[PDB]
């Protein structure tokens, strides 16, 4: 069932109870977890928090914890599968699901007693009616009904996508509880910006949600400040910004940010030998000295920093980059700490997807989660350093793939693969960073090629996972277009291709468009996908 | 001119308030007045110097940082005087034998990427520059006067506490009190500081191909 009011029939229920949080390892999940943590700590709710990153891990943790806890909250996981089938719970347990994944599984939708969904009912949802999904001429009519059922269920389950941010949902709950702090609002903003950075949502939906959060920012600012008398410099001040699309440009030199932003790198073809000259054309059009552009931004001359955004916008317009400016937010506190929401997103993501072989992925999750609090600001800066390394490695990998021409058409989709032992393949072994790399690589490819048909294709990308088990991760990306809905069918396509091939596919990740394959299975699996997409 | 003195006093007050008000930390953990405490501990240790980061000064007051970058010779004197008076109000009262206040050397540092010796063209003159290199020679420490007193040789009148410009530049003695050069410098009534000239060779990584290494 959908929860109609989070306050009464979710929060006031669990407020009297011991709770278990399962949280996915993504930045939106981390922000929603932080908001809910702060609420529970205000109300002395005895919660336990468990990270998870796949179905096997969630099943293991639930089997470990099922006896002691009756109330469970799943953040950014569980909505798009039958939780009762997967977990096999006792009937007295209750699962709250604040998950952005769409479409919601019909069993979770119509299970009234046990599965409760912390999902907005005014999100883009098209759930089929109950009578269409659940129960001689009567036999013929029944078989016709079953044919209708399979057709409508395939139409419902074909495309997966993402709804409103879980962090935004939790901040809505905090606002209804009248316990919303400025830091909670910042976590909500970072949660939305995670979806925008990873291209999980459309630009229109992102603009709408930014319009929602603008009102909350204005309310929080005018809560205790006006234009006549102001707060201490120590206090956090969140400001709406119509800022630049360039990544981490306030902590870098502008040259590095123009080099490693996927947008500008794809436009100017900076992987190519000619791309640096095109970048120099752009910089000379702006009139910025190269010794200033290659200097760190905080050390750049303030005469140049005065109107840099207008300069970059108006040069980008005539160079063909039509949407260089983006609606976003920034947070200021103290004298010297200034971050964009995209900066916090990249830092936390790099901490979580860090390639270091220390401890465990749960350890990297813990470092990422700690970095979202201002008492652990050093972790945030360290995450920014890791983001520098990650973005440089991303551009190196894209340059390698395009120069050696690993990205190759195979009919209805482009195909690419990373070989073992190549530079910085370890950084993209993990599925989430691989999905991000595939998106950036597809943007670079469609900006590079002259073939108008190839600009319309989706991308399938693979990389090694475990040589000892002989497995590869595989991800599927929809076509990269300006007006895409960011819906993709590769979940069901992978499932149906694997079933039609009897392939050894482990479906452990929460996105259905991310899978693990036994490596030798890839040839017949790819052939099946080619025959399927046709 | 009173307008000029007003400008100097305003800039000195702004540097004073930077050293008085700058903090690091967050409300979730706590705050420490970085340069206040550095001044206090260094003065109590008898060190009489501090190390002001240009990035911190830019964050507090970007105009001061820009002025100190473009015109360091003008503004470093004001910054040092501001540090001296901040040290006075931060440290006093002081025990016996420590009544007289001591001058404070405000060193400074930056997180900016450095330039190079061959990048130092004529347009960089009188600006702040940050260059790497290797020290190949180091002079013995020698005394340079910062303030002098000059006494007329004939009639024994005295001009006292004449401020000497910093650096290797000198001072021109007046030709009017008597002879054409009336004055001699009093060797006792003058205050001097250690100074040391060095030769900074260009980094071998930074030498262009086929060139000998420059030095500065
Ligand atoms: Zn005389």
XYZ file of C-alpha atoms and ligand atoms in Angstrom:
751
model
C 0.000 0.000 0.000
C 0.945 3.650 -0.410
C 1.205 5.660 2.797
C -1.195 8.590 2.434
C 0.258 10.639 5.326
C 3.806 10.010 6.499
C 3.216 11.752 9.857
C 0.255 9.814 11.285
C 0.463 6.325 9.767
C 4.268 6.032 9.487
C 6.218 8.275 11.841
C 3.938 8.258 14.874
C 3.826 4.453 14.555
C 7.578 3.810 14.518
C 8.199 6.572 17.098
C 7.039 4.102 19.786
C 9.213 1.243 18.491
C 12.648 -0.164 17.808
C 13.461 0.251 14.107
C 15.953 -1.211 11.622
C 17.169 0.987 8.757
C 18.417 -0.749 5.621
C 20.076 1.867 3.395
C 21.392 1.559 -0.146
C 24.887 2.838 -0.952
C 23.930 5.899 -2.976
C 24.124 9.564 -2.048
C 20.357 10.116 -2.081
C 19.961 7.141 0.261
C 22.697 8.545 2.507
C 20.994 11.945 2.705
C 17.588 10.417 3.452
C 19.279 8.285 6.110
C 20.860 11.384 7.664
C 17.514 13.219 7.785
C 15.733 10.239 9.331
C 18.634 9.718 11.750
C 18.330 13.304 12.951
C 14.567 12.953 13.471
C 14.983 9.686 15.389
C 17.741 11.202 17.528
C 15.492 14.139 18.399
C 12.758 11.711 19.520
C 15.045 9.062 21.146
C 13.941 6.324 18.733
C 16.176 3.278 19.270
C 17.080 2.558 15.645
C 19.737 0.283 14.191
C 21.341 1.242 10.871
C 22.655 -1.365 8.418
C 24.239 -0.563 5.029
C 23.379 -2.734 2.048
C 24.232 -2.585 -1.654
C 22.564 -5.665 -3.183
C 19.725 -8.112 -2.750
C 21.982 -10.841 -1.354
C 23.275 -8.415 1.278
C 19.769 -7.238 2.210
C 18.614 -10.853 2.489
C 21.596 -11.756 4.685
C 21.056 -8.770 6.984
C 17.316 -9.435 7.255
C 17.941 -13.103 8.065
C 20.367 -11.928 10.747
C 17.962 -9.325 12.209
C 14.450 -10.716 11.609
C 13.974 -12.141 15.111
C 14.621 -8.919 17.049
C 13.011 -6.182 14.909
C 9.419 -5.981 13.666
C 9.598 -2.520 12.026
C 11.938 -2.113 9.048
C 12.693 0.896 6.840
C 14.301 0.305 3.429
C 15.866 3.399 1.832
C 16.384 3.340 -1.956
C 15.774 -0.410 -2.148
C 12.979 -2.964 -2.211
C 10.191 -1.202 -4.115
C 10.838 -2.730 -7.549
C 10.742 -6.373 -6.319
C 8.370 -8.573 -4.322
C 9.739 -8.031 -0.819
C 7.582 -10.801 0.663
C 8.963 -13.326 -1.831
C 12.564 -12.122 -1.497
C 12.734 -11.782 2.295
C 10.069 -14.270 3.504
C 9.082 -12.311 6.642
C 6.753 -13.121 9.495
C 3.272 -11.695 9.023
C 3.530 -9.423 12.096
C 6.491 -7.474 10.668
C 6.013 -4.208 8.760
C 8.283 -2.902 5.980
C 8.362 0.814 5.268
C 9.858 1.496 1.825
C 11.191 4.965 0.960
C 12.602 3.999 -2.438
C 13.027 6.123 -5.555
C 13.050 3.088 -7.877
C 10.160 2.828 -10.342
C 7.887 1.111 -11.375
C 6.753 -0.204 -7.986
C 6.064 -3.930 -8.019
C 2.329 -4.635 -8.044
C 2.606 -7.004 -5.066
C 4.138 -4.192 -3.015
C 1.440 -1.827 -4.304
C -1.536 -4.030 -3.393
C -0.161 -5.676 -0.227
C -2.252 -3.823 2.352
C -1.135 -5.406 5.629
C 2.674 -5.659 5.525
C 4.295 -3.505 2.803
C 3.801 0.240 3.310
C 5.323 2.579 0.722
C 6.730 5.992 1.664
C 6.204 7.122 -1.928
C 4.269 10.162 -3.111
C 1.020 9.131 -4.783
C 1.291 12.198 -7.070
C 4.556 10.891 -8.529
C 4.458 9.551 -12.078
C 2.737 6.220 -11.349
C 0.580 4.093 -13.669
C -0.226 1.073 -11.502
C -2.660 -1.363 -13.207
C -5.998 -2.062 -11.569
C -6.323 -4.920 -9.085
C -8.856 -6.893 -11.138
C -6.488 -6.907 -14.139
C -3.664 -8.461 -12.077
C -5.319 -10.838 -9.558
C -8.166 -13.342 -9.765
C -15.720 -24.391 -22.030
C -16.504 -20.697 -22.475
C -15.528 -19.860 -18.886
C -12.113 -21.462 -19.447
C -11.663 -19.472 -22.668
C -12.582 -16.266 -20.829
C -10.092 -17.083 -18.054
C -7.312 -17.738 -20.581
C -8.149 -14.462 -22.341
C -7.903 -12.694 -18.979
C -4.476 -14.258 -18.417
C -3.335 -13.053 -21.853
C -4.512 -9.564 -20.900
C -2.619 -9.914 -17.607
C 0.715 -10.826 -19.179
C 0.392 -8.092 -21.823
C -0.471 -5.319 -19.350
C 2.164 -6.460 -16.847
C 4.856 -6.397 -19.531
C 3.729 -2.909 -20.559
C 3.927 -1.845 -16.901
C 7.293 -3.462 -16.077
C 9.170 -2.745 -19.335
C 10.780 0.618 -18.510
C 12.409 1.373 -15.151
C 13.068 4.915 -13.931
C 13.295 7.028 -10.762
C 10.729 9.118 -8.900
C 11.064 11.860 -6.314
C 14.183 11.818 -4.146
C 14.002 9.846 -0.907
C 15.850 12.705 0.791
C 13.108 15.073 -0.377
C 10.464 12.684 0.992
C 12.200 12.504 4.367
C 12.582 16.287 4.472
C 8.875 16.598 3.688
C 8.250 14.376 6.713
C 10.597 16.518 8.818
C 8.741 19.652 7.717
C 5.389 18.074 8.613
C 6.848 17.184 12.018
C 8.061 20.817 12.333
C 11.570 19.566 13.191
C 13.314 20.626 9.968
C 16.824 22.017 10.448
C 18.858 23.931 7.887
C 21.259 20.985 7.654
C 18.297 18.692 6.938
C 17.365 21.003 4.065
C 20.949 20.830 2.802
C 20.770 17.032 2.911
C 17.526 17.188 0.911
C 19.227 19.418 -1.664
C 22.205 17.055 -1.918
C 19.807 14.135 -2.339
C 18.088 15.812 -5.283
C 21.452 16.818 -6.746
C 22.552 13.170 -6.593
C 19.703 12.260 -8.942
C 20.551 15.180 -11.216
C 24.295 14.416 -11.292
C 23.728 10.728 -12.070
C 21.044 11.653 -14.671
C 18.398 9.567 -12.889
C 15.707 12.237 -13.516
C 14.650 14.504 -16.356
C 15.716 18.141 -16.513
C 12.079 19.237 -16.204
C 11.583 17.207 -13.022
C 14.866 18.528 -11.618
C 13.773 22.115 -12.282
C 10.407 21.403 -10.641
C 12.044 19.921 -7.537
C 14.490 22.837 -7.368
C 11.440 25.091 -7.485
C 10.049 23.135 -4.540
C 13.264 23.458 -2.522
C 13.606 27.181 -3.330
C 10.620 27.910 -1.090
C 12.143 25.892 1.758
C 15.467 27.724 1.355
C 13.673 31.083 1.461
C 11.708 30.013 4.548
C 14.848 28.862 6.357
C 16.719 32.060 5.493
C 13.885 34.335 6.636
C 13.305 32.198 9.758
C 15.906 34.246 11.671
C 17.523 36.698 9.180
C 16.524 39.681 7.038
C 18.258 42.343 4.933
C 18.736 44.737 7.907
C 20.306 42.508 10.601
C 21.957 39.146 10.003
C 23.180 35.987 11.712
C 26.686 35.075 12.805
C 29.134 34.029 10.105
C 29.308 30.611 11.807
C 25.685 29.800 10.945
C 24.939 27.774 7.829
C 23.520 29.897 4.992
C 21.981 28.050 2.029
C 21.622 30.185 -1.112
C 19.987 29.440 -4.441
C 22.500 29.724 -7.290
C 22.067 29.936 -11.061
C 25.590 28.594 -11.332
C 27.867 26.865 -13.838
C 27.628 23.239 -14.949
C 31.398 22.742 -14.554
C 32.398 20.170 -11.942
C 34.273 21.270 -8.797
C 35.352 24.553 -10.378
C 35.539 26.398 -7.043
C 38.095 23.873 -5.686
C 40.091 23.399 -8.944
C 41.724 25.492 -11.593
C 39.224 26.449 -14.282
C 41.391 24.646 -16.855
C 41.025 21.338 -15.007
C 37.263 21.763 -14.652
C 36.835 22.543 -18.343
C 39.045 19.508 -18.997
C 37.123 17.028 -16.828
C 33.508 18.186 -17.046
C 31.749 15.626 -19.244
C 29.754 18.379 -20.974
C 32.690 20.530 -22.109
C 34.991 17.539 -22.634
C 32.439 15.912 -24.937
C 31.809 19.186 -26.786
C 35.454 20.147 -27.378
C 36.680 16.529 -27.824
C 39.446 17.070 -25.276
C 40.357 13.386 -25.494
C 41.507 14.218 -29.038
C 44.741 15.963 -29.996
C 42.735 18.833 -31.532
C 40.589 19.371 -28.434
C 43.116 21.440 -26.488
C 43.280 23.900 -29.386
C 39.471 24.127 -29.387
C 39.578 24.801 -25.643
C 42.139 27.530 -26.300
C 39.773 29.028 -28.897
C 37.069 29.095 -26.213
C 39.359 30.640 -23.581
C 40.666 33.248 -26.037
C 37.074 34.135 -26.918
C 36.478 34.749 -23.217
C 39.740 36.701 -22.953
C 40.896 34.883 -19.815
C 44.717 34.679 -19.529
C 45.924 31.083 -19.551
C 48.128 31.672 -16.501
C 44.943 32.680 -14.646
C 42.829 29.817 -16.020
C 45.467 27.262 -14.972
C 45.717 28.845 -11.499
C 43.508 27.576 -8.682
C 40.121 29.287 -8.593
C 40.497 30.616 -5.045
C 43.800 32.205 -6.166
C 42.369 33.545 -9.446
C 42.137 37.321 -9.773
C 38.879 38.678 -8.368
C 38.598 41.010 -11.374
C 38.136 37.850 -13.460
C 35.955 36.096 -10.859
C 33.616 39.126 -10.726
C 31.520 38.128 -13.770
C 32.934 34.752 -14.781
C 29.504 33.108 -14.994
C 28.153 35.615 -17.531
C 31.387 35.379 -19.544
C 31.277 31.578 -19.669
C 27.555 31.625 -20.512
C 27.825 34.116 -23.368
C 30.890 32.408 -24.858
C 29.256 28.990 -24.450
C 26.190 30.237 -26.329
C 28.133 31.164 -29.472
C 30.313 28.041 -29.163
C 27.107 25.945 -29.228
C 26.788 24.919 -25.556
C 23.213 26.054 -25.004
C 22.620 25.200 -21.299
C 25.892 25.988 -19.541
C 24.095 27.574 -16.569
C 22.188 25.346 -14.133
C 19.804 26.034 -11.267
C 21.398 24.766 -8.054
C 22.285 25.716 -4.468
C 25.336 26.369 -2.311
C 26.014 26.302 1.437
C 28.250 28.777 3.285
C 29.404 28.547 6.890
C 32.309 30.117 8.684
C 34.690 32.347 6.773
C 36.237 29.954 4.235
C 33.888 26.962 3.707
C 31.842 27.217 0.491
C 30.420 24.252 -1.450
C 27.971 23.656 -4.272
C 25.480 20.809 -4.003
C 27.195 19.116 -6.949
C 30.490 19.387 -5.066
C 29.092 17.608 -2.007
C 27.534 14.996 -4.314
C 30.832 14.268 -6.054
C 32.804 14.208 -2.792
C 30.398 11.817 -1.051
C 30.137 9.635 -4.165
C 33.923 9.422 -4.479
C 34.233 8.506 -0.798
C 31.637 5.763 -1.222
C 32.962 4.445 -4.565
C 36.595 4.831 -3.478
C 38.904 2.229 -5.098
C 40.962 1.596 -1.946
C 41.215 -2.072 -0.942
C 40.901 -1.295 2.781
C 38.314 -2.944 5.002
C 35.049 -3.304 3.102
C 32.495 -1.453 1.021
C 30.563 -0.898 4.241
C 33.652 0.903 5.555
C 33.671 3.199 2.513
C 29.942 3.743 3.060
C 30.699 4.748 6.648
C 33.317 7.263 5.523
C 30.866 8.694 2.977
C 28.041 8.929 5.534
C 30.267 10.624 8.116
C 31.394 13.201 5.542
C 27.830 14.574 5.245
C 28.071 16.113 8.762
C 29.883 19.387 9.416
C 31.687 17.859 12.412
C 33.568 15.687 9.853
C 34.411 18.395 7.309
C 37.909 16.947 6.825
C 36.308 13.837 5.338
C 34.401 16.057 2.896
C 37.617 17.717 1.725
C 39.309 14.315 1.400
C 36.330 13.230 -0.685
C 36.880 16.234 -2.937
C 40.468 15.052 -3.482
C 39.182 11.570 -4.320
C 36.722 13.226 -6.719
C 39.636 14.914 -8.502
C 41.276 11.514 -8.938
C 38.001 9.874 -10.027
C 37.219 12.492 -12.679
C 40.751 12.378 -14.103
C 40.555 8.579 -14.315
C 37.130 8.846 -15.975
C 38.474 11.101 -18.714
C 41.528 8.876 -19.193
C 39.264 5.843 -19.632
C 37.000 7.693 -22.085
C 40.027 8.815 -24.101
C 41.371 5.252 -24.194
C 38.019 3.805 -25.280
C 37.466 6.356 -28.048
C 41.059 6.375 -29.339
C 41.365 2.580 -29.486
C 37.732 2.382 -30.724
C 36.457 -0.089 -28.135
C 32.989 1.459 -28.446
C 31.516 -0.442 -31.400
C 28.043 -0.746 -32.888
C 26.382 -4.172 -32.740
C 23.074 -3.307 -34.388
C 20.391 -1.950 -32.020
C 22.936 -0.900 -29.364
C 26.530 0.201 -28.972
C 28.850 -2.149 -27.067
C 31.994 -1.449 -25.047
C 34.155 -3.419 -22.631
C 37.133 -2.755 -20.357
C 39.946 -5.312 -20.411
C 41.710 -6.656 -17.339
C 44.881 -4.884 -16.264
C 44.221 -1.688 -18.212
C 44.862 1.624 -16.396
C 42.316 2.418 -13.672
C 39.891 -0.377 -14.548
C 39.819 -1.022 -10.782
C 38.051 2.303 -10.193
C 35.184 1.202 -12.486
C 34.929 -2.433 -11.374
C 32.246 -1.324 -8.918
C 28.802 -1.158 -10.633
C 27.751 2.393 -9.671
C 30.905 4.108 -10.923
C 30.661 1.915 -14.025
C 27.144 3.210 -14.725
C 28.355 6.799 -14.336
C 31.324 6.110 -16.632
C 29.045 4.566 -19.250
C 26.815 7.652 -19.247
C 29.785 10.017 -19.636
C 31.330 7.801 -22.323
C 28.091 7.663 -24.312
C 27.811 11.458 -24.187
C 31.390 11.746 -25.458
C 30.703 9.197 -28.207
C 27.528 10.837 -29.508
C 29.285 14.217 -29.438
C 32.220 12.711 -31.370
C 30.625 10.654 -34.145
C 29.315 12.083 -37.415
C 26.818 9.213 -37.832
C 23.358 10.582 -37.063
C 21.924 7.082 -36.590
C 24.654 6.161 -34.096
C 23.774 9.273 -32.072
C 20.375 7.654 -31.322
C 21.637 4.277 -30.014
C 21.757 3.062 -26.384
C 24.965 1.751 -24.801
C 25.845 -1.567 -23.170
C 29.096 -1.540 -21.188
C 30.957 -4.315 -19.369
C 33.951 -4.490 -17.044
C 35.647 -7.160 -14.900
C 34.225 -7.966 -11.464
C 36.032 -11.046 -10.101
C 38.789 -12.895 -11.944
C 38.747 -15.693 -9.352
C 35.048 -16.316 -10.089
C 35.481 -15.299 -13.745
C 32.694 -12.699 -13.753
C 31.981 -9.318 -15.344
C 29.624 -6.505 -14.426
C 27.348 -5.307 -17.244
C 25.249 -2.124 -17.376
C 22.748 -0.715 -19.868
C 22.262 2.991 -20.632
C 19.437 4.537 -22.730
C 20.187 6.870 -25.658
C 21.788 10.153 -24.586
C 19.545 12.899 -25.991
C 18.566 16.362 -24.802
C 14.855 15.423 -24.541
C 15.157 11.907 -23.100
C 12.754 10.755 -20.395
C 15.611 8.830 -18.687
C 13.549 5.639 -18.935
C 15.388 2.472 -19.958
C 14.325 -1.089 -20.755
C 17.635 -2.852 -20.118
C 16.439 -4.469 -16.895
C 13.770 -6.556 -18.569
C 15.933 -6.947 -21.683
C 18.791 -8.393 -19.608
C 16.371 -10.661 -17.727
C 14.667 -11.981 -20.857
C 17.980 -12.413 -22.699
C 19.459 -14.355 -19.774
C 16.362 -16.556 -19.446
C 16.221 -17.219 -23.197
C 19.931 -18.197 -23.041
C 19.853 -20.081 -19.681
C 22.713 -17.776 -18.706
C 24.456 -17.653 -15.322
C 23.312 -14.143 -14.402
C 23.403 -12.923 -10.798
C 20.899 -10.060 -10.479
C 22.261 -8.678 -7.213
C 22.067 -4.904 -7.836
C 19.008 -2.765 -7.089
C 18.844 -1.266 -10.578
C 17.579 -3.997 -12.883
C 19.807 -2.567 -15.662
C 22.949 -3.638 -13.695
C 23.896 -7.339 -13.610
C 26.743 -9.789 -13.026
C 27.553 -12.484 -15.608
C 29.897 -15.421 -15.769
C 32.371 -14.152 -18.337
C 32.215 -16.920 -20.962
C 28.406 -16.494 -21.012
C 28.777 -13.018 -22.567
C 28.869 -14.095 -26.229
C 25.543 -15.936 -26.290
C 24.077 -13.319 -23.930
C 25.032 -10.493 -26.304
C 23.728 -12.491 -29.276
C 20.437 -12.964 -27.431
C 20.236 -9.234 -26.679
C 20.887 -8.420 -30.347
C 18.156 -10.821 -31.469
C 15.814 -9.439 -28.786
C 16.197 -5.703 -29.410
C 16.145 -6.549 -33.141
C 48.211 64.326 4.032
C 45.306 63.588 6.367
C 43.463 61.661 3.638
C 46.491 59.422 3.136
C 46.845 58.850 6.875
C 43.128 58.034 6.998
C 43.590 55.445 4.239
C 46.538 53.862 6.062
C 44.641 53.848 9.367
C 41.571 52.254 7.769
C 43.620 49.500 6.119
C 45.516 48.907 9.373
C 42.213 48.664 11.253
C 40.899 46.147 8.721
C 44.025 43.997 9.137
C 43.662 44.374 12.917
C 40.084 43.115 12.794
C 41.160 40.226 10.561
C 43.703 39.128 13.157
C 41.183 39.731 15.972
C 38.148 38.005 14.421
C 39.337 35.165 12.177
C 38.241 31.697 13.305
C 38.409 28.118 12.061
C 36.041 25.279 12.939
C 32.295 24.722 13.048
C 29.526 25.168 15.598
C 29.098 21.377 15.705
C 32.618 20.999 17.187
C 34.031 24.360 18.271
C 36.079 27.388 17.288
C 39.657 28.516 17.851
C 40.853 32.020 17.026
C 43.753 30.830 14.888
C 45.876 33.963 14.595
C 45.014 35.374 18.035
C 46.230 32.186 19.691
C 49.232 31.936 17.371
C 50.209 35.521 18.257
C 49.758 34.895 21.985
C 51.707 31.636 22.100
C 54.511 32.913 19.855
C 54.899 36.122 21.871
C 54.912 34.229 25.173
C 57.526 31.875 23.697
C 59.558 34.899 22.568
C 59.191 34.101 18.858
C 57.673 37.429 17.710
C 56.454 36.139 14.341
C 53.316 34.687 12.772
C 52.402 33.054 9.449
C 49.265 34.542 7.866
C 47.773 32.429 5.083
C 46.712 34.430 2.032
C 43.705 32.153 1.507
C 42.464 32.858 5.039
C 42.914 36.602 4.507
C 41.039 36.341 1.205
C 38.171 34.492 2.888
C 37.921 37.099 5.652
C 38.350 40.138 3.378
C 39.067 39.544 -0.311
C 39.966 43.200 -0.926
C 42.769 43.044 1.651
C 44.161 39.896 0.026
C 44.025 41.486 -3.430
C 45.737 44.649 -2.158
C 48.428 42.573 -0.455
C 48.967 40.595 -3.670
C 49.210 43.633 -5.947
C 51.027 46.001 -3.533
C 52.737 43.936 -0.810
C 55.410 46.555 -0.069
C 52.767 49.101 0.933
C 50.428 46.810 2.861
C 52.794 44.415 4.650
C 53.967 47.302 6.843
C 50.358 47.956 7.858
C 49.800 44.238 8.460
C 52.897 44.027 10.673
C 51.814 47.078 12.684
C 48.338 45.557 13.057
C 49.914 42.321 14.289
C 52.041 44.303 16.752
C 49.062 46.059 18.332
C 46.979 42.854 18.329
C 49.852 41.139 20.138
C 49.892 44.017 22.625
C 46.203 43.775 23.507
C 46.303 39.956 23.470
C 49.368 39.582 25.734
C 49.208 42.469 28.207
C 49.656 42.715 31.195
C 53.179 41.206 30.913
C 55.632 40.395 33.767
C 58.676 42.413 34.793
C 61.318 42.730 32.094
C 58.680 42.290 29.341
C 57.043 45.723 29.517
C 58.329 47.029 26.178
C 56.429 45.668 23.183
C 58.418 43.908 20.449
C 57.964 44.124 16.695
C 56.197 41.197 15.008
C 57.293 39.717 11.673
C 54.209 38.689 9.675
C 55.383 35.970 7.342
C 52.794 34.719 4.873
C 52.093 31.648 2.765
C 49.634 30.548 0.094
C 47.973 27.452 -1.344
C 48.205 28.858 -4.891
C 50.150 27.096 -7.613
C 53.662 28.588 -7.926
C 55.211 30.480 -10.820
C 58.783 30.015 -12.112
C 61.943 32.084 -12.494
C 61.679 32.235 -16.289
C 57.996 33.157 -15.904
C 59.073 36.254 -13.936
C 58.795 38.876 -16.678
C 58.863 42.642 -16.160
C 55.117 42.936 -15.481
C 55.546 40.923 -12.245
C 57.619 43.734 -10.696
C 56.662 44.842 -7.162
C 53.980 42.102 -6.917
C 53.866 38.994 -4.764
C 55.414 35.995 -6.521
C 55.676 32.338 -5.491
C 58.473 30.362 -7.181
C 60.288 27.054 -6.376
C 64.009 26.384 -6.504
C 67.142 25.026 -4.861
C 69.404 27.077 -2.595
C 72.951 26.900 -3.984
C 74.570 29.650 -1.861
C 73.781 31.288 1.477
C 75.386 34.428 2.868
C 76.532 34.838 6.437
C 74.042 36.741 8.574
C 74.661 40.500 8.439
C 73.036 43.407 10.267
C 70.741 45.798 8.376
C 69.417 48.945 10.026
C 65.634 49.332 10.221
C 65.744 52.626 12.144
C 68.691 55.033 12.388
C 69.607 58.263 14.143
C 71.943 60.745 12.437
C 73.920 63.457 14.247
C 75.295 66.593 12.616
C 79.083 66.442 12.642
C 79.658 70.171 13.228
C 77.003 71.391 15.700
C 75.991 67.984 17.167
C 72.251 68.312 16.515
C 70.450 64.971 16.066
C 67.650 63.567 13.911
C 66.383 60.349 15.510
C 64.246 57.315 14.620
C 64.368 57.753 10.847
C 62.505 54.826 9.292
C 64.620 52.803 6.853
C 62.848 51.254 3.889
C 62.893 47.421 3.933
C 64.805 45.268 1.488
C 68.151 46.007 -0.121
C 67.180 49.602 -0.969
C 68.873 52.296 1.104
C 68.170 55.781 2.449
C 69.379 59.201 1.279
C 70.851 61.380 4.019
C 69.787 65.067 3.985
C 72.208 67.714 2.701
C 70.908 70.419 5.108
C 71.285 70.586 8.889
C 77.149 73.310 8.101
C 78.986 71.273 5.400
C 77.351 69.814 2.294
C 77.113 66.402 4.049
C 76.420 67.513 7.652
C 75.543 64.119 9.149
C 77.039 60.874 10.379
C 75.043 57.823 11.460
C 75.236 57.131 15.185
C 76.372 53.481 15.577
C 74.822 53.045 19.044
C 71.456 54.778 18.527
C 70.199 52.583 15.703
C 68.177 49.361 15.611
C 69.259 46.525 13.312
C 67.963 43.116 12.228
C 69.535 39.994 10.791
C 69.482 39.690 7.013
C 70.848 37.044 4.672
C 71.123 36.907 0.883
C 70.600 33.585 -0.907
C 70.893 32.297 -4.471
C 67.879 30.249 -5.607
C 68.607 28.011 -8.584
C 65.818 27.053 -10.967
C 64.496 23.531 -10.495
C 66.092 20.968 -12.875
C 62.561 19.896 -13.785
C 61.812 23.529 -14.711
C 64.874 24.209 -16.903
C 63.836 24.249 -20.597
C 65.688 21.872 -22.877
C 69.253 22.880 -23.714
C 69.360 25.778 -21.226
C 71.624 26.356 -18.258
C 69.734 26.687 -14.944
C 68.934 30.278 -14.057
C 69.252 31.560 -10.501
C 67.595 34.401 -8.594
Zn 74.488 71.280 11.824
